[PDB]
Amino acid sequence: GIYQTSNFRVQPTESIVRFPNITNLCPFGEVFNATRFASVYAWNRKRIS
């Protein structure tokens, strides 16, 4: 007769990694490299979102 013993499935060859970009282009760069830095007593902030 015939007996269903096991299975032989094909395994994935590899895995592809990348990002879809999406909400992007951060202006975060213009924080550290700038001009006219404030003083210690003066307080400053720059929200990034």
Place this chain on the structure above:
Amino acid sequence: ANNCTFEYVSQPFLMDLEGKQGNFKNLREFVFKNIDGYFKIYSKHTPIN
């Protein structure tokens, strides 16, 4: 306009330069929302007269 929190800048959206005389009425619809702290927005531009 004092007490600030956030300021986002983008180019104009949903506007063109078309010149015609006749029946070309259009309808613009959005979905204003506020969920999870994000004022979500869904839109569907449906030019119809």
